[PDB]
């Protein structure tokens, strides 16, 4: 019956997705890698990539079919995807010690990890005749109305999905499969709003959510915020970095800070949202001339992840970020991109709501905001390897 | 390599026989204007015999399967012909009742020690018997026999699936039979109580892109039958299978190819000829053979025993001015078979021929003139009764001739 | 290690018997140039017996299966020979009526305490009986006995899934019989009330690998 | 999943026993038509 359902669902596909699926059956790894890191380029390459049409039609085919109930999936995942740089056990070893289990449990206590690519999954437990490439097994509960495309292989049937969410691990236990120890993790999907390339859709959402926000502001504070974001945001942030109220207190800027904070506090974000901000080395306590800014050698990336991944963050100033993820000529030289998930109910406002050029879809957050970094990944950008940071805003 | 052999045939005449029996009692009364009373009694008997000319009888054949190849066959499904005189009565593909699950090389289905299986149905579901006509039934009753010929065999081989399990369904040998036959030469070793048939890949010299390795006939034989080498000669298990110790039978094409290749060869040995596609080589080990060095098989003993000279094909000649006498007790030969006696001879200096005398059924005398080198003669005889008089072989001759590798081999 | 043993054989003679009886009444009148009136009445009896020399009788054999190995066989389907004197009358593969679902080592199908099963059809769909000749019927009436030989047995094994799910379909024992027999030695222990047959792997000293 | 309706392989016998085991049967007879129903009933001996 599963084969018949797969045949039925694949019959109604049109041709373009037909050769897309056929090409996926032989070049899975490269297509998956491209789909993982595709939205961090300029507007030119994304339209100019040789695989953009492939990805578009594959995504459409996947999104054609959706499930009406939550259901479970099973797949093997590398522990490196969950910010674990060590090895649980070798591929020839049979057992995992208590120390490695404890370390892996400690690494994933309270964190959320984002998955952003294609993946082959199974609707049944991995019994005999399957492959066990990693010592980590995932029991993932997919939410309602998510894409799921069953396609018949040469002999068996396999299913492909598109990851667009962030998952958290509840419990991990050690199990035995055919005389080898594995780690089984029960994970749940946490929903969030992400506009990877639909910058138009994100802008429309910002309009629909914050166009009337300005009408809720008292005119004096409204004009205050407008003029400040227009001209003096640089000065305010520069004053805030130096801990101005601590060193040289002055009310001419404390009033500005309070007004901006109250304006942001007036209307909070209603739904979980992801924002992309191109950060600089000066933010991370580095300089452009610093040797660690060269992310081409593996040693620099490894040291940066060792000393920064999994730690916290704190910005005394305000944070300006864009809903879209595509690179711009304004921040072309910045090698670090900050990926931030905004929990529902947190303070923040859409600056671009007001008419005119209010910014690059800018979003403001309250001062003294703190973040937790979960994982760090690197993607190629022309002739240099740039770096991506996943962070979660915390109250 | 799977064949089918019939062991006996059973005929079921399709006739209807009936018998009747009755009795009657009567009574009469007449009034003529006189009177009369008549009492009667009766009996009756009857016999009948009805026959259908279209389907006069049914036939049942007891058969066996055997394998002489190198690989097992799973789900053995042969197809056989039944021929009476020149007419094929029917061709039947084996049904579920006559399928052999396993057939290992050298084995038999049903296994040795069990009765043969019955082939007595012709339809797909084993629900219809095999009929014959009235004329065919008359021919059968006249002493004519039915022969069985196997035309093809269907079977499966085993592989490994995505797991470690063996799978045989869907793996048909017919997908590979033609390809294997197209690029290989066939070699058969007859031996005494077991036959072996092999396929050895041969190189095509007309194709520059055929990179398969080249082999001579001797190397092919050694690889195919797992023969070992003792002193440059091949031994199967203990029987010597060197070209001088056996009988070699070819078809016309193979004989022509070997003859053409021999004249351009240096050693001029058959085992040095290059192996080619389509060759058919049959090797037949002799029943009795002696080389006068280490191998002796005859029940009797030759009169002349003088093997102290380094002559012959391999270090022994056993010939002087004396004569050799041997007598086969006729209790060690097949009742009705066409044997052949063979050997090699040489006259280093020209002399008289050798009087070859064979007396098995009809006494025969023949003369052979040895050349400067070694040549073989191979005259024929035939046994009679398994209990008749002995067979005497004598080679009276003069002129200090020479001999080696005397052998007696059966032929069909 | 599965075998079949025959417990008894039953013969069904295929004969047709008829019986008739009639009554007749007559009456005649004659005029000459005299007169005469004649009254007649009679009766008759009849018997008959028809026989077909091609299919003169049907046979039915009662059999059991037994297992002396180490593993169970599922869906036991044996093939048997029926031999009268030196002739194999027929070979039958068991149909759906004669298939044993389970046969554990040391067990019997049908289980101990039940009657043997009847093998009385030869076609695939169990709609055709097993015939014999007139000569074979005469031989049977002369005291000669029919022997039953088992030539092969088909069956399945179970592959256990990680969640304890047994599957037997598509797992044929015939795929392993030749391979096991090729590399093993056979040892049989007979005792008195039960027999045990085993295969133990043996080393080939001619292969360095 | 496409909005289509399929009936092959959807047998009621797989659910008859389960429905009968956990339900009560009620029949209304009226005059022109009969109605039969099963209504789920709670097992008081099972705390779960
Ligand atoms: Ca010699």
Author numbering:
A (entry chain H): 19 to 413
B (entry chain B): 299 to 331, 364 to 742
C (entry chain C): 299 to 331, 364 to 539
D (entry chain E): 492 to 539
Sentences reproduced from the published study:
Some bacteria express a binary toxin translocation system, consisting of an enzymatic subunit and translocation pore, that delivers enzymes into host cells through endocytosis. The B-components of the C. perfringens, C. difficile, and C. spiroforme systems bind to the host cell’s lipolysis-stimulated lipoprotein receptor (LSR), after which the A–B complex is internalized by endocytosis. Then, the A-component is translocated via the B-component pore across the endosomal membrane into the cytosol, assisted by host-cell chaperones, including Hsp90 and Hsp70. In the cytosol, the A-component covalently transfers an ADP-ribose to actin, causing F-actin depolymerization, cell rounding, and eventually cell death.
Here, we report two cryo-EM structures of the CDTa-bound CDTb-pore, long and short, at 2.64- and 2.56-Å resolution, respectively. We describe the interaction between CDTa and CDTb based on the highest-resolution structure to date of the CDTa-bound CDTb-pore (short). By contrast, the short structure showed no density at the tip of the β-barrel stem (residues 332–363) because of its flexibility. The most striking difference between the structures was that D4II (receptor-binding domain II) was observed in the long, but not in the short complex. Binding induces the unfolding and tilting of the first N-terminal α-helix of CDTa, in addition to conformational changes to one of the constriction sites in the CDTb-pore, called the NSS-loop, which grips CDTa. Our 2.56-Å resolution analysis provided more precise insights, revealing ‘in’ and ‘out’ loop conformations (blue and yellow, respectively). In the A, B, and G subunits, which had almost no interaction with the CDTa via the NSS-loop, the loop had two clear conformations. In the D and E subunits, the NSS-loop showed two conformations. However, in the C and F subunits, the NSS-loop was only observed in the ‘out’ conformation because of steric hindrance from CDTa. (3) Two NSS-loop conformations would adapt to fit transient translocational CDTa states: the unfolded and folded complexes showed different ‘in’ and ‘out’ conformations in the subunit D NSS-loop. The short CDTa-bound CDTb-pore map represents the total map, showing the small differences between folded and unfolded CDTa.
